[PDB]
Design a protein. Structure first.
Lengths: 68, 67, 45, 287, 70, 289, 289, 287
C-alpha cells in the first residue's frame, strides 16, 4: 500500500507538471495560429487587389494595341 | 495522515478537471480558426493560378504581336 | 483533437510550398519578359 | 514630430499647387487638353499630400485629402483606384471623426457591388457594422450589415463567415430577447457543425444555447426540445450542458430557489460564466 | 479487495504516462514546423508586393509612352 | 426588395441588349468587317449581366448567361477564360440543376487537363464526387472520381491528398463493396506509416480495420491476419485493440454470444463506436450460429 | 576548394568587366549621350556580380558590390530599386561587419517613409533594433527603435505586434529604467487583454510584474497597486501570484530574511524562476533593512 | 485502359507530326528565313506531347520529351522555360530511372545558380539528396547535398531550414561512427534553442543526443559534458534524461551490465526507442 500510494503521488505530480506544460504550450498554439490567420488574410486581400489590377492592365494594354 | 492525502488528491482532481476543460474549450475554437484559414487559403491559391495563367497568355500574345 | 489537426496543418504547408514555387516562377518570368520587351521597344527608335 | 508638421505644412503648399493645377484645368488646359496625365499626377500629388498629412498625425486632414483625391480620381477611369482611395479615406477617418468614413465606405461598397466583388463588399459591411457597434449604440444597423455580409458569403459558398455572422446576430438577439431567431440560428449552426468531424464536438454548446432560448419562451416545450436534441445527438445528454439544463427545468417545476441557486453556484464553481449567460439566467429564473 | 484497486491504479498510471508523453512529443514537432510556413508566407508577401509594384510601374509607363507616341 | 427587382429587370434588359449586340455584330462583320471587338464586347455585356443576375438572387439564368458568354469566348480561340466561366456556371447550377453543373465541370476538367494542369482536374474530380454523393444516393461513380483524383494527385507526387482519397474509397468499399480492396488499402496505409513523423501512433487503427474486414470474411483468415499484424507491428501487440479482437475471436470460436455481447458493450462504454465498426460487428454476430 | 577558387576567379573577371563598364559609363556621361541604358547594363552586371559574390561566401565583397550598384542606380531617377539594393547590401553586411548595414537600412527607411509604405518601414526598424541589441552593447537605442516600431504598427491599426513591442520595451526598461513606465505599459496591456478573450487568461502575469515593480520601488504603493488590480480583476485574487506577493510583502514588512527566503524557495521548487524576476527579488531583498 | 490507349495513339500522332514539323521548319528557315515562330510551335508541340505521354502513364518517354523541349528552347536563347521543362523531365524520371532525373535536376540547379537565385537551388539540392537516400545507398552524396542546402539556407537567414539540414547531417554522421561533427552540430543547435520561447522545450533533446554520442567515445568526457550541459541549462536535471544518463554512467562504471539492461528495458517500456537510439545504446553496452 505504501509503495502504491507513493507511486500514485509521483504520478499526480507528473500529472500537474505535464498538464501545465501542455496548457502553456496550447496558449502559444493559439497566439501563433491567430497571428498566421491575420497575416494570410492580409495576403489574400493583396492577392485579390493585384489580380484585379493586372487584369485591367492587360485589358487596357490590349485595347491600346488594337488602337494602333 | 492518509485522509489529508485523500483531500489533497480530491483538490488536485478538481484542478485537473478545470485545466483540461479550459484546454478543450480553447481547442474547439482552434479547430474553427484552422478551418477558416484553410478556407481563405484555397481561395488565394485559386486566384494565384488564375492570375498566373492570364499573365502567361497575355504576355505571350503581346510578345507575338510585337514581332 | 491534436491528431486531427496534425494532417490538416501538414497539408496546408505542403500546398504552401507549391504556391511559393508557382509565384516564384511567375515573378521571374514577369521580370525577364517585361525588361526585355521594354528595352526592345525603347531602343529601336 | 514637428519636423513632420513642417513637411505637413509644405504638403498643404502642395495642395495649394494642386489648386493651381485645377486653375490650369480652368484656363490653360484649353490648349493642354491632352494633359490627362497632368490630371493624373495632380491626383498623385493629392494622394501623397494626404500621406504626409497622415504621417503628420492629422487624421481629419488626411481623410479629407484622401477623399478629395478619390473624388478627383473617379473621372470615369480607374474606378478601382478611386475605390481604394475612398477606403483609405475611411480608414483615416476611423479614428477621430468616423461619420464620413461611414459614407465613403458605402461608396466603396457600391463601387465593388457594381463591379461584382462580393467578398470585399461583405468585409466592408462587417467593418461598418463593427464601427457602429464600437462607436454608436445602434445594433440594428450592425445586425443588418452582418446579415447582408453573411448573405454575400453564402452566395459564394463562403459558409464559415456567414455562420459566424449569424452566430453573433443570434447572440445579440438572445440578449435582445428575440428568441425565435436565436433558437433557429443556434439549432441550424449546431446541426451544421455536427455534419463534419472537425466541428463535431462543438455541437454541445450550440444545442445548449438553443435549448436555453427555447426554455425561456415556453417552459413546457423545454422538455421536448432537450429530448429532441438528445436523440438527434446521442452524445448531448452526456454533456454537462444537458444535465444542468434538465436539473434546472426539473427544479423549476417546484418553487424552490435553493435548488437552482445551488445548481448555478456549483456550475460557476467549476467554470466562470459569461455576461450573456448570467444575465439570461437572472432574467429567466425570476419568472 | 485491494488487488483490483492496484490493478486499476497501474492501468491509470500506465495510460496516463503513455498518452501524456504522446501529446507532449507530438505538439513540439508541429509547432517547430509552423514557423517555416510563417517565414514562407513572409517571402510570399515580399515577392508579391514587389510583383505588384513592378506591374503598376510597367503599366503606367506603357500608358504614358503610348500617349506620347500618339 | 426594390434592389432585387431592379437587378432582375436591368439584367433582362442587358441580356436583350447582348442578344441584339451579337446580331448586329454578325451583321456588321459582313457589313463593315470591323474585326472582333464587337464579339468581345458582347461577351463582356453577357458576363456583366450574368454576374449582376446572380447578384439578383436568381441563379439558373445567371449560369445560363455565363455559359453563353463562355461559349462565345471559346469561339474566339480562348480556352482558360472560357473554362473558368464554365466552372463558375457549374458552381451556380450546383444549387439550380446538378446535371448542367456536372457537364460543365466535365468540360472544364477536359480542357484544363489538356492544357497541362492536373491539380485543378483532380480538385474538380473531388468536387464531382462530393456533389454526387452528397445529394445523389450512389457511390460507384463517386468511387471512380475519387480514384481519378488520387491518381492525378499521385502523378505529381502529392501523397497526402491521394492517400486521403484512397482511404475514403476503401472505407466506402468496405461499407458496401467487397473487403479485399478495403483490406489491401487499409493494410497499405497502415504499413506505410511506421516511420510517420507525426502519425507514429495510429497505424493500429488501420490494421485493426483490416483485421475486422478479415474477420468479416472468415475466422481463419481473421486470425492469420491478426498474427500477421501482430508480428509486423510490435506496438500493435500491446494495443487495447489487439486484446479486444483476440477476445472477440476466442469467444466466437466457442460459440458463446454472451462473451461477444459483453466485450462489444464494454468497448462501446469505455470508448464510443464509429458507425462502421458497429455494422461489421453486427454482421459478425449474425453468423454466430 | 576548387569550386570556391573558380568562383573567386570568375568573380574577379566580373569585377574587371564591371570596371570596364563604369569606364564606359563615365565615357558616355562626358563623351557620349544616352548612356542611361549603358549604365543600366552596368547596374545589371554589378548586380549579377554582387549576387555571385554572396554565393562565393565573400559577404564583404557581395555587400560592397551591392552598395556600389545601389549608389550608381540612385542617379537613374529611380528609388525602389535603390531601396532593394540597399536592403540587400544590409543583409550581406548583417554578418561580419554590420555597422554600415545600420546606415543603409536607415537610408531604406528614409526611402520607404518617402514612398508611404510604413509596415515595411516598421519591419526594418525592428530589424535594426534587434541587430543593434544583439551585436551592439547598448539598449537605449534599441528601446527607441522598438518605440518607433510600436508607433508605426499601432498607427497602422496593427495592435498585436504593437502590444508585443510595448511589452518587450517596458519589460526591458524595467531592468535598467525607472519602473513607473513599466507600471504604465504593463497595466495598459493587462487592461487591453482582460476584455479580449485571447490574453485575458495571461494578463495576470503582466499585473504581477507591474506589482513586483511597485514593490521593488516601495511597499505601500505596491500594496495599493495590487489591491487595485485585484479589485479591477477579481480572478487575480485566487491567482497563486497574488498569494506569493501577499506572503512576500508581509515578510518584507515584518523584516524577516528567513520567511522571505523560504517563501521564494517554495515558489522556486514548483515551476521555475527567471533571470529578471530573480534580479528583482534580490534587489528588493537587498533593501529590506 | 481505353483512355490510356487513346492518349498514347494521339500522342504518337502528335510526335510524328512534331518530327515532321521540326524537319520542315528547319528546311523552311533555310530556304525562306521565316523567323523563329515555327521553332517555338515545335517546342510547344513537344511540351504538349510530353504532357499527353504523362497522361498515358509513360514517364520515361514523357521525360525524354520534356528534355527535348528544354534543349530546343534553350537553343532558342531562353532559360526559364528550358529549366521548367528539365525539372518536369526529372519529375517524370523520378520513378523508374532517376539517374537522368538527377542529371537534369543538377542542370536545373546549375542554371538557377547562374541566374543568382538561392531558395530554388537549395530546394533542388535537398531534393537530390532525398532521391539519393530513397533510391540509392550513397549517403555521402546526400550528406554533401544537405551541406550545400544548409549553407544556402543559413546564408539567406533561413535559420529553420539550415537547422533541419544540420540536424539530418548530424544524425547521418553519428550513424556512421562520426561523433565530433555530430557533437558540434547537436550542441550548436541546442545552444541556438536556448532563448527560443518555443524551441526551448526541444533544446533538451539535442543536448541529450549530444551527450550520448560524446559518451560513445569515453566515460569521463561524457560526465564532464553532461555536467557542463546541466550547468548551461540549470533545469535540464528535471527531465528523466539526466537521471538516465547518470544511472547508465554508474552502471557502466561498476560493470553492472544486468542493471544497465534492466534500466534500458524499463525506459523502453515507459517510452519505446527507435532503431538509431537502440543501436547507440547497444554500442555503448559493448564496452
Amino acid at each position: 500500500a505504501l509503495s502504491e500510494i507513493e507511486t500514485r503521488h509521483s504520478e499526480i505530480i507528473k500529472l500537474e507538471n505535464s498538464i501545465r506544460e501542455l496548457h502553456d504550450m496550447f496558449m502559444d498554439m493559439a497566439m501563433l495560429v491567430e497571428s498566421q490567420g491575420e497575416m494570410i488574410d492580409r495576403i489574400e486581400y493583396n492577392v485579390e487587389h493585384a489580380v484585379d489590377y493586372v487584369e485591367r492592365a492587360v485589358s487596357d494594354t490590349k485595347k491600346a494595341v488594337k488602337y494602333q | 495522515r492518509a485522509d489529508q492525502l485523500a483531500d489533497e488528491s480530491l483538490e488536485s482532481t478538481r484542478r485537473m478537471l478545470q485545466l483540461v476543460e479550459e484546454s478543450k474549450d480553447a481547442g474547439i475554437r482552434t479547430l474553427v480558426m484552422l478551418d477558416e484559414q484553410g478556407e481563405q487559403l484555397e481561395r488565394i491559391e485559386e486566384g494565384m493560378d488564375q492570375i498566373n495563367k492570364d499573365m502567361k497568355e497575355a504576355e505571350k500574345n503581346l510578345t507575338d504581336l510585337g514581332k | 483533437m491534436f491528431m486531427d489537426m496534425a494532417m490538416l496543418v501538414e497539408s496546408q504547408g505542403e500546398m504552401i510550398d507549391r504556391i511559393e514555387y508557382n509565384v516564384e516562377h511567375a515573378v521571374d518570368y514577369v521580370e525577364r519578359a517585361v525588361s526585355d520587351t521594354k528595352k526592345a521597344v525603347k531602343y529601336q527608335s | 514630430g514637428m519636423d513632420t508638421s513642417g513637411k505637413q505644412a509644405e504638403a498643404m503648399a502642395l495642395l495649394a499647387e494642386a489648386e493651381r493645377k485645377v486653375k490650369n484645368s480652368q484656363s490653360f488646359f484649353s490648349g493642354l487638353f491632352g494633359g490627362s496625365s497632368k490630371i493624373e499626377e495632380a491626383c498623385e500629388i493629392y494622394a501623397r499630400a494626404a500621406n504626409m498629412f497622415k504621417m503628420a498625425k492629422n487624421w481629419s486632414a488626411a481623410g479629407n485629402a484622401f477623399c478629395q483625391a478619390a473624388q478627383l480620381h473617379l473621372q470615369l477611369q480607374s474606378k478601382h483606384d478611386a475605390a481604394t482611395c475612398f477606403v483609405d479615406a475611411g480608414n483615416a477617418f476611423k479614428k477621430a471623426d468616423p461619420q464620413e468614413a461611414i459614407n465613403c465606405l458605402m461608396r466603396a461598397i457600391e463601387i465593388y457591388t457594381d463591379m461584382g466583388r462580393f467578398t470585399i463588399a461583405a468585409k466592408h459591411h462587417i467593418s461598418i457594422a463593427e464601427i457602429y457597434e464600437t462607436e454608436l449604440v445602434d445594433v440594428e444597423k450592425a445586425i443588418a450589415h452582418y446579415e447582408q455580409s453573411a448573405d454575400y458569403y453564402k452566395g459564394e459558398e463562403s459558409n464559415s463567415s456567414a455562420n459566424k455572422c449569424l452566430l453573433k446576430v443570434a447572440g445579440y438577439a438572445a440578449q435582445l430577447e428575440q428568441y425565435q431567431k436565436a433558437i433557429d440560428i443556434y439549432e441550424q449552426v449546431g446541426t451544421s457543425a455536427m455534419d463534419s468531424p472537425l466541428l463535431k464536438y462543438s455541437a454541445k454548446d450550440y444545442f445548449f444555447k438553443a435549448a436555453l432560448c427555447h426554455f425561456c419562451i415556453d417552459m413546457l416545450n423545454a422538455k421536448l426540445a432537450v429530448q429532441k436534441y438528445e436523440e438527434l445527438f446521442p452524445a448531448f445528454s452526456d454533456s454537462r450542458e444537458c444535465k444542468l439544463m434538465k436539473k434546472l427545468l426539473e427544479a423549476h417545476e417546484e418553487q424552490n430557489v435553493d435548488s437552482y441557486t445551488e445548481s448555478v453556484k456549483e456550475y460557476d464553481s467549476i467554470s466562470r460564466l459569461d455576461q450573456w449567460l448570467t444575465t439570461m439566467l437572472l432574467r429567466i429564473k425570476k419568472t
